[PDB]
């Protein structure tokens, strides 16, 4: 229909893009922000260098998370519009080769666990690094990566295997459901680039999310699961089940269909007589976005990816205006972003064509 | 059963949770802080990550009184609520592969001591990571440091039998009576959790200290000793009492229930018409919680252990309400923390079962 | 032949200095800054010292850019008072010496591409080194780098052969074309000195540009290309397109004739009564000097090599009134330079002869 | 008089300690400030940790001094109160192993002049650690550092015993009095102690310093002696001649009872109604305490070391009670010191027994 | 005597110090500057330690000169007064000492020249010391400094005799009058200390620098000289030229006798009523003290050098007043310094006795 007073483009508009094989003026200009100045654009150079995440006072052990989110993106921009597929797949190209610097992943060594990022455990970092692998030879039909790719899912492969719970934990003894969900969408994504039937174990692993680490009830994850202690965390956490619910979503659609009324009734705040939206991040409390600070941006992934319309504009309502966005020399600034990884979660849910349509991606026109 | 201004639950609440087998409200909130939000909660990760006690400023020295502290803390949850047993378990391991980083123990070396933190002295450091070994084992069952934890034993049963006099120094020379009480008490643990008999240089030490370390008609402990002088630091101290009397109460209850009326006496100031208190930290001045500060945080400790909920109410209405608690998205935090170990103590002193209880915790059985 | 305030001589007189065979007076006031204070001055020795750069705040992936556009000028001053041309040469023996220190390529380095900054790609770099090697010999007699000349020039010339698009990338999977113009430029510099024809290697160069790297009806280059993956950035660049036509002016003076007008009707905008002219950096925006904010700057040259005298003065009136001029002891200072490489660019700017007449310096004495 | 707004006791208090063989409330205070709360008190540790100097910002190249000056006071304090003689030896032995920290000597390094701090020259640093080894065995009667103690006396000997002018110089080729004093009062520390004879070579000292390097009719030392050049510098320092003077006292008191009315005279301004005092460091100005900025703090240790209650009260009165000095859970603390090593050089002067009494000491138990 | 606000004693005092055989006070309190305070003043110790100069904030390239300009300020002391010639010398073995601190020297290697400072060019260091060597042996007759003296000065001959123009150069290709008349006054000094005569390569030199390197009708010359591209930089120089001018009188007082009118005409300006004056640093601008601004301090010097009691007064009454002297427990302190090496020159400026008096310096005895 209309705009509110502070949104750059209606919610119809975006997600009309595909239909319309074009993206909306300000994911341009946010393709531009991305791409455009010399040395300090996030994705100018394939080189170790993170002007970009400086200016943005990224914390170091987010740098990661951000690359991954632009990833996922680009992916859908591909799908969208077959003029910046080349530009997309060149992007994806860069966030592979950055991931794998050691400002990136070396948390992993200071923090004292080893000086090899890929070899066990680790899942919330080579969980996206593998799933990047596979989106950007999806992309661009590129095998620049290939060997890299196929000794990481085999990796993945033999530890989830090897576990008597369904999965990996990333850090020693520390079990997430968002970082598995992650893990096991690259296991599709190889399957599909290659012959293989790493998916199979799938199954299994909704299955035993479903016992103990989700309530059903509520539809919601809790915090997290410790196999040595066998302790889940009391709490359950909203940005942690909408994350997880979206790229479950892709796998199997009717799991999180089954859940997302009930995550709804359970997190989401309606206010200003039906127009915003906000999330709050745990039960038992009143205040939305504590935390991580992130319920609000991913349920707003969420909905895109649930094809809700009504949800994911009352969210944009709440986040976006109070950020003040403006468009200046045709590239997308905030004045006041409003979270952790702002502009790439906002540029990820805008495009976001669902990760099963990422999963069908036609072959580059070559 | 009444409120008192500022306060968060009554001390009749306080006192009955292990009754009630559950927690308070805002002690599940404390858990919350203590294990919530990602990388920066101090329970997250195993690793050697401290950016949870960066956050609040803490010197590195009293980092590992710090863990030490929600250790004990988290013993008594166990206690409290068997749902929330294996996810204090859990914190455990968390403490106990924290306690062991450089970052923890490393003033020993620069200090021009030594390279190996538990090797001879420094009782101060091994004290209290010996007894974390013999907690997490009771808690969970788990054998996991069990080694690590005869070791150390044999280590401090084997300097206390060298020594002329009763128990260790902690830096070469000086001698305090908490730090031993500490490593008195690990050696109860180890007894407890196997046949042995290593408590019993118990008795020579507590006759050792009421001789020439107590003011008995004061019931207060000299600051220290120091055995190649002979020196006795001619100033009684209340924190270094309030602390050895609490945990020296789950050794020789009847020691401990002969000097605390002593202790109060010489010590605690009651004001605002009996409904508040604070404590001297020495004799011969007017002022509450000079030196380091804990006078009256480690005598709401003591007054826990003691079962007295009258001084347990006057101090904790004197400490919390100025450091102004809220509860915000259901983990707690205080706006103005009035000294060193601030949450940590009020933590361990909401919970505490007593030190002799700890030492008697049944096995994880259901 | 008046003059607005801030301006220091009149487009007239610097397009007469050649046929005058003199500088302005600022034009010598900024030689003074280049050469008269002890340490500071950019010019005072060969040495790795810097300070005339950290006075100015230039980021240090800029360095190799002033020393270059300095380096450029000087030619000029050169061909332009005989009088001046030892003095040039000197400066232009310091500027190569410079362009070698580490603090200027080091870079390459630090973002992680290797050890050594002339072996492969990195032509952002030793493309402009190699063309002042070749202007430092044509100004002045000496064969002081002629070894370091050949050797680099080859480097190009095989790089170039062994490539399967025209031309030469900077980073890798980076193609600009502002660089490879200058690469190109050097070597016709090269064949100038010597029997050689490198420079056949311009006319494929320039068929390929003029293909998908350009929008002929705009007269605009692409910001960049991108081999591995074919792409290129769909945003048209006026500081791109300024650097380039005015180099590929030097080679191909009919290339260059064709895309100005379009060029000038795509991005300048004259202003105020027609006495003024500021560039917009990209299409689809009203924003003068966005991105790296050089387009007027760069116009500016381009203005002067096109021998376009009006809109050269209508930038220079833009340009250098508000950074306010001044005079003290004899040498040039601006109080608010409006940009990166400000004196360098309005240097060069006004003492520019013409990439051509450059190529063809008539020979130094013996 | 009554007890003025910023002094903690009377001067007759202080004075009458060792009669009544207690240290006063304040002075009690300032060994609390010393050794009370963990990690940061001065005296918690043996270790290499300074974090109290680092809460006070001094000089590194102070730090010897300030180990020393407390060193000093300990003594008396031993001396004074039996009761806490135990607690004065612990706190010595402390002081003996921080001074020993590269921290505290690493100067002689960073300046160029070597790696070891003992071995020749450097009298400003091994002459204090040679005395302070002397004082803590007087104290303790313990061996602990004796053989060190042998070591370094056997250097400073020999060391004068090669020089052609008589004493030692600190850094190459500069020669203090003040230093010096302090190295000849080891020798008589040491010969109490043991059976020895060091202590002869004070003679052709004191005959010595009292040629060039002493004005006698203004009662005061020329800044410093340089003996290759022959050169002593032209002016004459308070805070030089204040130390020099208090030291000198302890081994020929008849020398100091000379020079001191002169001194006072020369350097010592009296104001406020004669209730107090401030010391010119210098001839031919009328500033008081320029240069270090210690003229004023050091003759309050010479005033007590003569036995001069009047200026002791006059220069205490003067100093004391604009640094704000007050007590907190019984330690003692100064919000505005007005010079380097103001805490310690109050708490010397305040308990000085006499460098002869501490000479005397009799031993322990 | 009638003394301007800002002033400290007359021009005519200054004049007559070396007739009266005695420095006035305010040279005094400016050696006191140098001596007094331990630690922190910078002729307290003849280590590696700078803190003199940090607390003033002189740049690292800087601090070389510094300690040669305080170096012939104190020649000049003790041809003053036989009594603090002993003083002067001392100060001076402490400059030599300090000179070859890596921290003086040390720019040479991180700029990327070598390692070694003093085995070719460099001559802007390495000819200020070898003249520091022989005013240190004429002042106290001591040879400790004599071999380094001796093969240094070799050094320097050697270099000029193989060289196709006349001197040395300072960086690679970087020629400078005012660093060579440092050079070349040093062999005037080992001459008069030996039998020898490497001050004859002098007349080339002079022959030289009048032919190329001045503007003789402007008696100015140009900035530098770069032997290799044959460029001479077309801007003159005042502070070049003061300091030159200086230098040579000592050498062929003729030589600046020709050019010292002319100088004066193209690069000074007289202002208030002729009372005062202020230096040009370079041609066609009206602004003084420009570039690296020290043009008025050195030409002060100039003026002492040849005996222009009325220029001297002028320049010394624009510099002095505004940087607000006064003395401080008898030391000279300054609020507002002008310019860098601000006391360093005005005390040389002070005292200096005339580099050919300096030549002829007799025996101590």
Redesign the interface.
């Known amino acids: 229909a209309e705009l509110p007073p502070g949104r750059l483009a209606t919610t119809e508009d975006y997600f009309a893009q595909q239909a319309k094989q074009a993206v909306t003026p300000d994911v341009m200009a946010q393709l531009?922000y991305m791409?455009?100045?010399?040395?300090i654009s996030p994705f100018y150079?394939?080189?170790?260098?993170f002007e970009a995440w400086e200016l943005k006072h990224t914390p170091q052990?987010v740098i990661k998370y951000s690359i991954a989110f632009y990833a996922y993106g680009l992916a859908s921009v591909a799908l969208i519009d077959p003029?910046?597929r080349?530009?997309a797949?060149?992007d994806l190209?860069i966030a592979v080769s950055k991931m794998k610097?050691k400002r990136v992943w070396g948390?992993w060594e200071?923090?004292?666990?080893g000086t090899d990022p890929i070899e066990k455990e680790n899942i919330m970092y080579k969980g996206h690094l593998n799933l990047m692998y596979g989106l950007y030879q999806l992309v661009?039909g590129?095998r620049?990566y290939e060997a890299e790719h196929a000794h990481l899912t085999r990796i993945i492969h033999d530890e989830i295997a090897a576990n008597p719970f369904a999965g990996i934990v990333c850090?020693?003894?520390?079990y997430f459901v968002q970082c598995n969900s992650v893990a096991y969408l690259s296991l599709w994504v190889y399957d599909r680039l290659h012959g293989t039937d790493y998916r199979a174990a799938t199954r299994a692993w909704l299955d035993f999310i479903q016992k103990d680490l989700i309530d059903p009830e509520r539809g919601a994850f809790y915090?997290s699961y410790?196999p040595?202690?066998?302790?889940?965390?009391?709490?359950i956490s909203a940005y942690t089940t909408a994350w997880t619910l979206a790229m479950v979503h892709g796998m199997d659609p009717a799991f999180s269909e089954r859940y997302y009324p009930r995550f709804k009734q359970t997190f989401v705040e309606v206010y200003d007589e039906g127009r915003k939206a906000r999330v709050?991040?745990?039960?038992?409390?009143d205040?939305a976005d504590?935390?991580?600070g992130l319920a609000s941006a991913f349920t707003l992934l969420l909905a895109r990816e649930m094809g809700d319309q009504q949800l994911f504009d009352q969210l944009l309502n709440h986040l976006e205006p109070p950020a003040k966005p403006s468009?200046?020399?045709?590239?997308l600034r905030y004045e006041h972003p409003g979270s952790l990884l702002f502009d790439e979660l906002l540029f990820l849910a805008k495009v976001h064509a669902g990760f099963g349509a990422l999963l069908r991606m036609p072959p580059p026109a070559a």
Do not use: M, Q
Request: a negative charge; proline letters at 4%.
């Open positions: 531009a791409n455009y100045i010399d040395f150079s394939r080189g170790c260098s052990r003029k910046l080349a530009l797949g060149h190209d610097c948390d200071e923090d004292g666990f661009t590129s620049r850090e020693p003894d520390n915090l410790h040595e202690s066998g302790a889940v965390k009391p709490w709050r991040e745990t039960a038992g409390t205040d504590g935390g991580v468009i200046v020399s045709a590239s």
